[PDB]
Amino acid sequence: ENKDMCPICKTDRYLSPDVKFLVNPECYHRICESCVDRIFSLGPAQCPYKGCDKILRKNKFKTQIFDDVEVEKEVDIRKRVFNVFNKTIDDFNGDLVEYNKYLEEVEDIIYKLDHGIDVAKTEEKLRTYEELNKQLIM
C-alpha cells in the first residue's frame, strides 16, 4: 500500500499517487509508472517488485488500483471465468436453482482460482475453461 506500490517507488501514496500501479493480468503486482513503463516498453520483463521474477508483460496490463489484491486476483479470476463460462446454461429456459447452482459452480472455480488450494482442481478448472472455450467456438 503506502509502503509497497512499486519495485522502485514502493512508497507512493504520499509521493503524489496519481501515476498508475498496473497489475499485468499476469503480475498481480503494484508497479509504479516508472517501472511498469520501463518494462512493457522494453517488453515483457519481470517487474522487480520485492524480489519478483514474474514477467511484467508488454502492454497487456489491466487496472487494479489497490483493490486488495486478494480481491484483484479474485476479481481478475472471476471475470475471465465468468467470461469463459459466459452464459453456460443460466437462462436457457429460466431455471433459478440449476443456473444459480451452475452460478454457484461458476464462481466456485473463481473462489478456487482466487485460492488455488493445492492446485490440481484449478488445473481442472482450466480444462473446463478450454472445454467452455471449445464449446463457445462450436
Next chain:
Amino acid sequence: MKFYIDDLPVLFPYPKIYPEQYNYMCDIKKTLDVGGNSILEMPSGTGKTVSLLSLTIAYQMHYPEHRKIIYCSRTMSEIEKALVELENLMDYRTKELGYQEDFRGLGLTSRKNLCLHPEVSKERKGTVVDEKCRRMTNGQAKRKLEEDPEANVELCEYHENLYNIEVEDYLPKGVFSFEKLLKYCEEKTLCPYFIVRRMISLCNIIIYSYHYLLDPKIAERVSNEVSKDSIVIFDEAHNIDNVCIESLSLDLTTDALRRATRGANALDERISEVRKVDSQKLQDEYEKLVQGLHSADILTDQEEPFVETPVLPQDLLTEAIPGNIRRAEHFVSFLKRLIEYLKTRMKVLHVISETPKSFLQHLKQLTFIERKPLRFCSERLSLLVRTLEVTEVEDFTALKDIATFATLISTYEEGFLLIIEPYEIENAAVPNPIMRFTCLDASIAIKPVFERFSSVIITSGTISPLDMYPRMLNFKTVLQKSYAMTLAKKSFLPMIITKGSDQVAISSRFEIRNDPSIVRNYGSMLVEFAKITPDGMVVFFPSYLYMESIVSMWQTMGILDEVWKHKLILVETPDAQETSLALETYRKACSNGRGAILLSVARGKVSEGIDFDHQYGRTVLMIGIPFQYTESRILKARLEFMRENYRIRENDFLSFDAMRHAAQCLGRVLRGKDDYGVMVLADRRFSRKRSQLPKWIAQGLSDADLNLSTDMAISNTKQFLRTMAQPTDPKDQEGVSVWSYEDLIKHQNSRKDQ
C-alpha cells in the same frame, strides 16, 4: 366525572374538564366511528393526552371491536409520560367504576434501559448490552448452556425466569409504567424486557416510539393481534418525515470500509475455520438455500436472527437462491469484490450523486453481479454467521453495514438518491470521503401502515400546516381539525424581536458566526432576559455550532459573568449524561431558588421529549430561526424531490420545517391552562412567518408585537409577569373556560346539541 358522548360513558380522570378537550373528544370519537386519519392538532396548552386516553379507553372498553390501541409518541420520555398518566386515569376510572379493568398496558422501549442483568446493563452502548444478553441468553448459547452445563454461556437468568413463570402468563395486572415495570421485574428478578416483548400478544394498549413503527429494522415482529382491528394514535406527529428519512438513510466512511476488510478477512478466517471443522453444516444450509430462503431458521429464530432486515418488513424480497452466492466462498469472494468497488467510488474526487439503478448499472458495468443475488446479502450474511455461530461481532460490524447498503441499493429505485461526497467541507481537503445514501419520499415509509392500518389519528400541539402531511405522506384524512385556546386571560407572550436596542434586525441566518453588532445585541437581549424572567428560562439556538461559537466568545466578553450573578447557567453537551446532569439540575434549580437557565439547540435532543412546566419554563427564547442549509446539498436533493415529486418549493419547505421546529419549541413552556410564560421570537424573518406559526400560537401573536426592538419586549413581559403574578380567579369566568364539574358541560353543551 362521567358524562356521555350520547353513547360513551367517559370516566375523565379529573372532575373538572376543559372545552378544547371536549371538542377533541367529539372529533376523535367522530373520527373513530368512520375510518379516517383526521389530523387533529391539539395545542399542548391543554391536556391532549388526558383527552386522548379517556375516550379511547372508553371507546375500546365501550365498543367491542377495537380491542387493541396503539399510541406512538416520538421519544421514550413521552412514552412513560403516557404510561404514568394512563395509570392515573386507569386508577381514577377504577376509583369511580371499581374493578372493571381487565386491562394490561405496557410501554416498550429497549433492552439496555430494561436489562436487569447488571454486567450486561453496566455496559453503555446499545450493541454490547443486547449482544451480551444474546451470547448470555441465546437459543444457541442456551443450547451451549443446557447441553453443556458450563461457565461459558452465562444467562441473564432474568431471561430464564422470564422463561419459567412469565412465559405462561403476564405481569400481575399493572399498566406498568417504566418506573413500575422495572421495580416489579427487578423484585421478581425478571427481565422486564423478555417479559414485555412476550406479552405484546396480550396487552390491550401499547406505547412505543416511532422507530418501532417506522424503523423497519426493528419493525419486524409486527403481530396481527396488536395490529389487525386496532386503533392508532400519533402523538407529537410533526417530526414524522425526519424519523422516516432517518429510519431509511445510510452512510459510509473509508475508515469503516477498512473495518469491513478486517472482518472480510476475519470471515475469510471465520468461514475457513468452521468449514475445516464442520462444513457438513455449511453445506446443510446450502440445500436449506436451494429449497428456499431458509425461513425455517432465518425467521423462525428464538434468539438467532443475526442481521436484521433494513428493507421494509419482508415485502420487497424474493425467496430464491442468491445465484452464485449459495456458496460461502462465493459470498466471501463476492464480499471480497464488493468492498473494493466502494473504495474506488469512495475516492471519487468530488460530490457525485447517482440513482440506485445507474449505480447498480455502473456496478454491473465494472462487475457483473446481478441485482437479484445482490439483494440477498442481508439474510445471507445473518445465517452464515450463526452457522458460524461467531463469538464476536466487532470484527464484523462494518460487514453488516454493507449488507444493509447492498440490500437497499439493489432493491429500491426512483425514490432514493445516492451521493458521493469525498470530504466534509467544514474540514475539506482531508481524507474522509462519505458515500451518502438517503430517501426523498417520506410517504414511502408510512405507506404500508397507511396500507395496513385503517383508523389512525394525527395529533400534536404544533402541527402546522395540517396539509403538508397529506401532501408529503400521501394519505387521506377526514377531520383535519384544530382547536383554538379559549381563555379568560392572556397567559403567554409571543414576540417578534426583529430589532435590538440599536433598532437593528437580528438573525442567525447571517452566518453561524460572530458579528459583534448582532452578537452583542444578542448578548444584551439574553442578559436582560436573565434579569427579568423568574426561575426557569430556556432558549433554542438554530444550530449547536451556532451555540458553540456564540457562547464561547460570550464568555470572552463579560456577558456571562452577569448572568452568573443572577441565575445558574447549564449548557447542552453532546454527551447527554452531562446534558441530563445539566437538565435535572436545571429543573432542580428551577424548583429551587436561584434561577436556572437551560440553553439548547432547536434541532437538539432536549426539544424532542423534555417538558418545561410552570417553574421549569417561563420565558422561552428563539435566537434566529433554525435552518439547515448551513450544511451540504442533501436537503437540496430531497427538496428537489420535494420540488419534482410534489409541488413544494425550496423556501416553502424550508420555512415550514423551520417553523415546524419553531412551533415545536415554543409549546413546551406551557402545560395547562394555568400555565404561563413568554415565547419571544428574535429574528427579522419572524415578522413575515407569523402565519406559519400554529393557530393557537398565532392567536397570541398580535400585529403590534411584530418586529419589536428588544427594548419594548422587556416592558411588555414586565407588565405580563406582574399581572400574571396576580391571583385573577373569578371562578365564574372559569365557569366559561373550565366548564365546571360535569354540569357546565352537561348544562351548556347538552343545550348546544343544536
